[PDB]
Amino acid sequence: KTSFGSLKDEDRIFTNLYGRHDWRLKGAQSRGDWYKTKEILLKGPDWILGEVKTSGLRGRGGAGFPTGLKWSFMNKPSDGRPKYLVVNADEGEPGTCKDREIIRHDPHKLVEGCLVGGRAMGARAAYIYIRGEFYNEASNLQVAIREAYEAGLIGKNACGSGYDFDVFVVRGAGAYICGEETALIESIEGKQGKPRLKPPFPADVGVFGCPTTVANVETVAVSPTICRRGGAWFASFGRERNSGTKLFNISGHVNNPCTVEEEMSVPLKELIEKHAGGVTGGWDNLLAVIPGGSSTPLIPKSVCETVLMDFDALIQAQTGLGTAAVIVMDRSTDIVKAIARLIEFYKHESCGQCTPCREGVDWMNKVMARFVRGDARPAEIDSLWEISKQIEGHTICALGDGAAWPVQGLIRHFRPELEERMQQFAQQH
C-alpha cells in the first residue's frame, strides 16, 4: 500500500459516532458490541495481549506508545495488592473532542473495552476518570454501566466467564493537568492533580499504590473489536508501525468542523477536504495547521500539502500526531495571537509543582504577550527559543514539553512575522 484514507463504513469501529442510533445496550448489541465477550475472556490474558500486540495499536491519548507492550507490564503474578485499570477520559487537550463522542454515543464499547482490557491486565476493576465538565456524558456512561451490571456483563461472573470486574466512574473538578497519567492517579486518590516522578512506573506502584495501567478512552474502546476481528485486520490499515483507524477532530477555519473516523496515514489535505469541506476561503487561504492538538508544533501550508497523518510522518515534519486533533488557521489569522493564547492556556493549567514549568511557562507567556503587540526586540526571539529548551526535558511531566513545542513551532516557521511586528511597533514609537 502507498495510499491510505478511503475507509469503508464496514471497517469503521465507532459506528454510532454521531448518535443517530440507540446509544444504550439494545442498540449497542445490535451493532456488534458485547458479542462473544465470554469467549474472549476465556482465551486468557496472553491471547488478548497477543491480539493487541499484533494489531500494532498505539496510545491514542497523545503519546502514541505501543499499547500491547504497555499493557504487558501488568501480566505478572499477583503480589497481594489489587490490580486496576484506569481509563483516561479527562480530554483536556485544546482541539480534542473525540473521547467525548465515544463516552456519550458508544458507552458500551468503552465498558466492554474496560472488561477486555482489564482481563488482559488481571485487574479487578476499572476506574474511568472523566473530566467534571462532561456531566451529561458521565451520566450516559453511568446509565450504560447500570445496564451492563443488570445483564451480568460486568460485576460478579462477568459475561459468565467467572471473572469478577467492577467499573467505577470518577469525575474530575477542572484541571487539564489531570489528564497526565500520574496526575490522574493522584487526583483519584484525593490530592491535587500533581504528577509523580518516574520510577516507580504505574505498572508497579499506581493508584492507591497498586499496579495500574492508564489507558486513553479511544485506546480502550477499540480493544474488543481488535479481539473479535483480530489484530491482522486492524494492522491492514495505515503504514507499518502506524496501524489502524483513528478519530480526527477538524476545527478552526474549515467550512464544516467535525469529528470523523478515518484511516491512519491519510493525507492531511485529503482529510480536510473530504470530511471538513475544505479550508474556509479555499486551500490557498490556508496559513498553518496544528495537526495533533495544542501541544504539537504548527506546520505551515507548504508542509500541509503532502504530510500524512500518522506518528512517523508528522515526526519527520517536526511535529506529532498527538491526539489527532487538527486545528486549521487561514491567512486571516493573527498567528502570533493564536499561539500566545495557547501559551496562556498552558499558563493556566500548569500544576506549579516543578520549577521550569511553574516559572518558565509563566515567563514564556509574558514574552509572548509582548510579541503579539510587537513590543520587543529581535534578539528576544532567540532568548525565547533558548528559554523553551530549558523547560523541555527538565520538568517532571510532559506539560512542560507541551508548552515549549508550540512556541518552537511558531519561531521555526513564522520568525519573519514576529520580526515584522517588532518593526511596526518600533516605527510607531
Ligand X SMILES: Cc1cc2nc3c(=O)[nH]c(=O)nc-3n(C[C@H](O)[C@H](O)[C@H](O)COP(=O)(O)O)c2cc1C
Verify binding: residue 386, other proteins, rule CB under 8 A: yes
379 binds, among ligand SF4, ligand X, other proteins, none (CB under 5 to 8 A by kind): other proteins
- 230, 398, 417, 425: residue in contact with ligand X (rule CB under 6 A): 398
Smaller CB separation from other proteins, 63 or 369? 369
Verify binding: residue 385, other proteins, rule CB under 8 A: yes
Verify binding: residue 5, ligand X, rule CB under 6 A: no
- 382, 393, 423, 426: residue in contact with other proteins (rule CB under 8 A): 382
Cell of 265: 496515514
Residues that bind ligand SF4 (CB under 6 A): 177, 194-195, 350-354, 357-358, 395-397, 399-400
Q: How many CB atoms lie within 10 A of CB 398?
A: 17
Verify binding: residue 383, other proteins, rule CB under 8 A: yes
R_g over Cα of the chain: 22
**Residues 311/322, Cβ–Cβ less than 8 Å:** no
Verify binding: residue 93, ligand X, rule CB under 6 A: yes
**Residues 133/125, Cβ–Cβ less than 8 Å:** no
- CA 255 remoteness from chain centre: 24
- Strand-pairing partners, residue 326, are 250
Cα distance between residue 182 and residue 291, in whole Å: 25
Q: Which residues contact 50 (CB under 8 A, 6 or more apart)?
A: 68, 231
Q: Does residue 45 have a cis bond before it (omega within 30 degrees)? A: no
CB of 356 to other proteins, least distance (A): 16
92 binds, among ligand X, ligand SF4, other proteins, none (CB under 5 to 8 A by kind): ligand X
* Torsion angle in degrees (nearest 10) through CA of 297, 217, 89, 144: 150
- 15, 140, 216, 245: residue in contact with ligand X (rule CB under 6 A): 216
Q: Which of residues 350-389 bind ligand X (CB under 6 A)?
A: none
Verify binding: residue 126, ligand X, rule CB under 6 A: no
- What is the CA angle 356-385-314, rounded to 5? 95
Smaller CB separation from ligand SF4, 25 or 177? 177
CB of 350 to other proteins, least distance (A): 24
- Minimal CB distance residue for ligand SF4: 357
**Residues 105/136, Cβ–Cβ less than 8 Å:** no
- Residue 207: how many CA atoms within 13 Å on its side-chain side? 27
Question: Which residues make up each annotated binding site for NADH?
Answer: 59-68
Query: Which residues bind to other proteins, rule: CB under 8 A?
Result: 379-380, 382-383, 385-386
Question: Which residues make up each annotated binding site?
Answer: 59-68, 171-219, 351, 354, 357, 397
